[PDB]
Design an enzyme around this catalytic site. Structure first.
Site, short mmCIF file in Angstrom:
data_model
loop_
_atom_site.label_atom_id
_atom_site.label_comp_id
_atom_site.label_asym_id
_atom_site.label_seq_id
_atom_site.Cartn_x
_atom_site.Cartn_y
_atom_site.Cartn_z
N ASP A 1 0.94 -1.14 0.12
CA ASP A 1 0.07 -0.02 -0.04
C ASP A 1 0.98 1.32 -0.07
O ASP A 1 1.55 1.55 0.95
CB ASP A 1 -1.04 0.13 1.26
CG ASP A 1 -1.61 1.43 1.36
OD1 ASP A 1 -1.79 2.02 0.47
OD2 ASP A 1 -2.68 1.22 2.33
N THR A 2 0.84 1.88 -1.07
CA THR A 2 1.66 3.11 -1.26
C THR A 2 0.85 4.32 -0.41
O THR A 2 1.77 5.60 -0.14
CB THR A 2 1.93 3.59 -2.67
OG1 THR A 2 0.62 3.60 -3.37
CG2 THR A 2 2.85 2.55 -3.33
N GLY A 3 -0.20 4.33 -0.37
CA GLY A 3 -1.09 5.29 0.30
C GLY A 3 -0.81 5.23 1.97
O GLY A 3 -1.51 6.06 2.48
C1 LIG Z 1 -4.21 9.07 4.36
C2 LIG Z 1 -4.36 8.09 3.38
C3 LIG Z 1 -5.37 6.86 3.55
C4 LIG Z 1 -6.82 7.03 4.12
C5 LIG Z 1 -7.48 8.34 3.56
C6 LIG Z 1 -4.36 5.69 4.43
N1 LIG Z 1 -4.93 4.52 4.32
C7 LIG Z 1 -4.25 3.82 3.33
C8 LIG Z 1 -4.93 3.17 2.19
O1 LIG Z 1 -4.16 2.72 0.80
C9 LIG Z 1 -6.19 2.20 2.45
C10 LIG Z 1 -5.91 0.69 2.53
C11 LIG Z 1 -6.77 -0.17 3.15
C12 LIG Z 1 -7.52 0.00 4.23
C13 LIG Z 1 -8.50 -0.76 4.74
F1 LIG Z 1 -9.09 -0.38 5.90
C14 LIG Z 1 -8.93 -1.92 4.01
C15 LIG Z 1 -8.25 -2.17 2.95
F2 LIG Z 1 -8.61 -3.10 2.18
C16 LIG Z 1 -7.20 -1.20 2.18
N2 LIG Z 1 -7.27 2.30 1.50
C17 LIG Z 1 -8.50 2.39 1.74
O2 LIG Z 1 -9.20 2.87 2.73
O3 LIG Z 1 -9.22 2.09 0.45
C18 LIG Z 1 -10.65 2.26 0.58
C19 LIG Z 1 -11.07 3.05 -0.59
O4 LIG Z 1 -10.58 1.99 -1.81
C20 LIG Z 1 -11.31 0.64 -1.17
O5 LIG Z 1 -10.39 -0.32 -1.24
C21 LIG Z 1 -9.67 -0.46 -0.20
C22 LIG Z 1 -10.88 -0.34 0.81
C23 LIG Z 1 -11.37 0.87 0.47
S1 LIG Z 1 -5.12 3.63 5.85
O6 LIG Z 1 -5.41 2.34 5.66
O7 LIG Z 1 -6.17 4.38 6.46
C24 LIG Z 1 -3.63 3.84 6.72
C25 LIG Z 1 -2.57 2.91 6.46
C26 LIG Z 1 -1.55 3.21 7.31
C27 LIG Z 1 -1.67 4.23 8.33
C28 LIG Z 1 -2.60 5.31 8.40
C29 LIG Z 1 -3.65 4.96 7.55
C30 LIG Z 1 -2.24 6.25 9.44
C31 LIG Z 1 -1.20 5.42 10.40
C32 LIG Z 1 -0.32 4.90 9.07
O8 LIG Z 1 0.69 5.52 8.44
#
Ligand SMILES: CCC(CC)CN(C[C@@H](O)[C@H](Cc1cc(F)cc(F)c1)NC(=O)O[C@H]1CO[C@H]2OCC[C@H]21)S(=O)(=O)c1ccc2c(c1)CC[C@@H]2O
Lengths: 99, 99
Positions: free
Chosen positions: B25-27
């Site tokens: 996950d690059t995000g």
């Molecule tokens: C700030 C940017 C963003 C949030 C706005 C960060 N997120 C990373 C995203 O890549 C997530 C990954 C994901 C999360 C998940 F619950 C389930 C999944 F299958 C995948 N994608 C996401 O929510 O995707 C959604 C939309 O598309 C759909 O597909 C996937 C599901 C739906 S985070 O996971 O919240 C996160 C990770 C690490 C950290 C934090 C926060 C702070 C502490 C540490 O740094």
């Protein structure tokens, strides 16, 4: 362009006549953007992530120029803390992970 | 290896003598994993996402072999829907986005 991951992979996008900054997110299956008016019509939708679920407006066949690369696909509009370029659009511009 | 994004960029990881599958996950700025038994002490922490916030256990200096590439860094354990390898560890194995 090759993007290192030492900083947030933010890119400039053009969508609906507006310029924004979005995160190239390989962990997201869908593209999710903060509130805006994307012409063309929509259908209610709910998507979930870390911390729970949010209600979004699903817009289809929406054009987006991501860092100069054009693509059309579904675009979810809702209360995301940030704009996210999902895999639905990353595949269209030929983005790949490299290690 | 080059990974296209037509499907979820899932990889197998080894952590604490356990084999799991995690999403590159690059995000994500940091690595967050679903419930598991990680030997050591930890520190409570709060992290936010699309749906809100979750409480995680912050484990530091944790070794993880991602697709045969070893790295040490912080690993958050909590109610995440899917295991995600964040940018804190992606940089260690030399991951880059290419479009
Ligand atoms: C700030 C940017 C963003 C949030 C706005 C960060 N997120 C990373 C995203 O890549 C997530 C990954 C994901 C999360 C998940 F619950 C389930 C999944 F299958 C995948 N994608 C996401 O929510 O995707 C959604 C939309 O598309 C759909 O597909 C996937 C599901 C739906 S985070 O996971 O919240 C996160 C990770 C690490 C950290 C934090 C926060 C702070 C502490 C540490 O740094």
């Amino acid at each position: 362009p090759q993007i290192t991951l030492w900083k947030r992979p933010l890119v400039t996008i053009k969508i609906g006549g507006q310029l924004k900054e979005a995160l190239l997110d390989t962990g997201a299956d869908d593209t999710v953007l903060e509130e805006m008016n994307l012409p063309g019509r929509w259908k209610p939708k709910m998507i979930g992530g870390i911390g729970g679920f949010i209600k979004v407006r699903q817009y289809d066949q929406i054009l987006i120029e991501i860092c100069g690369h054009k693509a059309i696909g579904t675009v979810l509009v809702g209360p995301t803390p940030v704009n996210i370029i999902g895999r639905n659009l990353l595949t269209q511009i030929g983005c790949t992970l490299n290690f």
